Amino acid sequence: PVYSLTGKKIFVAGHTGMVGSAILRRLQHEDCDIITAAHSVLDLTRQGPTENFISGHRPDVIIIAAARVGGILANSRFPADFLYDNLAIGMNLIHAAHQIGVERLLWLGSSCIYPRDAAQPLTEDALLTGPLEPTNEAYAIAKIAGLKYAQSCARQFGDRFITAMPTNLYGPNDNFDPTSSHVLPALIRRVHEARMRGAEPLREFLHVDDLADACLHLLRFYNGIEPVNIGSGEEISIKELALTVARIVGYERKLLDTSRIEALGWQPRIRLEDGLRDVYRNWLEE
């Protein structure tokens, strides 16, 4: 373990988010001091307020889960917002972290910022080797620049700043809105609406609490500069995923290469059919 979190003060930016809240849940267990700021009190695109907040609380560890995220229609109609919000969050936090000597920093990239036609399964060195997908190019540019700005700080100063590249996420605090772009909630939604009515391609899915655990594992064991994929490893088809969904409700590619994270001795622990059913029931309970 290159670094222990116990005793450190950790800032979890975007703690109300899907990823951020999962990191907070994993962190309630550790022996540390957690530090949060609601979106309503601290806009992380504001460089002044962000620097004073970092320079005052002086955390040892920044985990950047604050972001502007959305489906394809939002990305394509609000590119300036998706580029600026995400890029200014990362620049203001990475620069603030470098100025005061923050010991560790975690920036979050994404599977959808690799080149659109990169060979599958996607290794981390596929980054920037070809054209971006146009529909979320603006989001991707923001996440890549933050990643590269973290890399340059590690290069020039030895700042221990790293980027994780997650994949599609599911689990607690997911989006079940009828306008969600998350295929998995949408299936749980559409299949449940069918069973109660009574009327009658490969993909990856990662549980958010596995992602949270992997993010802490990287913080404790990963010292490299290059980014690290956090994938599911167990894939499934839209057809097979449909069967797994309709077979819990009662109703009648995009693959990452995870060699790097596995060489650090991490692999997701929650099974798809196990996490799905746990998500089906608590959608009902509400």
Add this chain to the structure above:
Amino acid sequence: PVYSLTGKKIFVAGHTGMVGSAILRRLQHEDCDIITAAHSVLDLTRQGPTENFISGHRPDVIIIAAARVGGILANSRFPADFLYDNLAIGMNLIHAAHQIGVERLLWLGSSCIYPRDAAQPLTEDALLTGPLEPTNEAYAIAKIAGLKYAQSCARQFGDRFITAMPTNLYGPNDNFDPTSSHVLPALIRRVHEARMRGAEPLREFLHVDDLADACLHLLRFYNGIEPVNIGSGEEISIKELALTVARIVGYERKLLDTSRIEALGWQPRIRLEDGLRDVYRNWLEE
């Protein structure tokens, strides 16, 4: 002419620079109000001071020539500075410009931010189609993100923001320091040191006052979203360039595709051997 500069208030950021000062010189002729801020009074990486300066002077046109520039050794040893300084300048100015409705904005890209192995001559759609040159990747990432952030504002809001992609520049206020990375001053320097001592591959070169004129031409006639190369068009070899240099002192690829700027009716006017000799003499006068 889609837009006239006469009557408008134009901010020339980085007016002390090599490009910026040339734009100022071209602008002294126009009927406009020029607005400058010395680097010493306004750090354009500071979002707060930059917004208050834009929101107070309220220019109609922002020309962004402020930047952090250097040769290969600086780029490779100070990547974080070359990424952050340039990216924060562009983000703070583009966002400030969008917030108050700045009618026109010019961001400057560069020839060295195309993929390292893109087919020559480099068309503007070669951007991001392959890996960057590692030595100035950090600079390039900054210039690309600014470019794409300008593009996204034009896309989402119709902000009339454009990027020009110049090539190697020479002319007034050039760098003749013995540590200059500019090959052309270095030859003028090395060849003059030889002639007074007495002891005895293709490239492009663009005159800075041609670049300045082309930048104003784009502002007046170019409404597109995509970037526009501003190249020399007349190329020359390191061997032939050497002959042209040693044949003024008395001593004994990287090519852009300029179709787009030529379809706007612009082509550089200053001849290499004419601008060189004009630069040889005024180096002596000092």
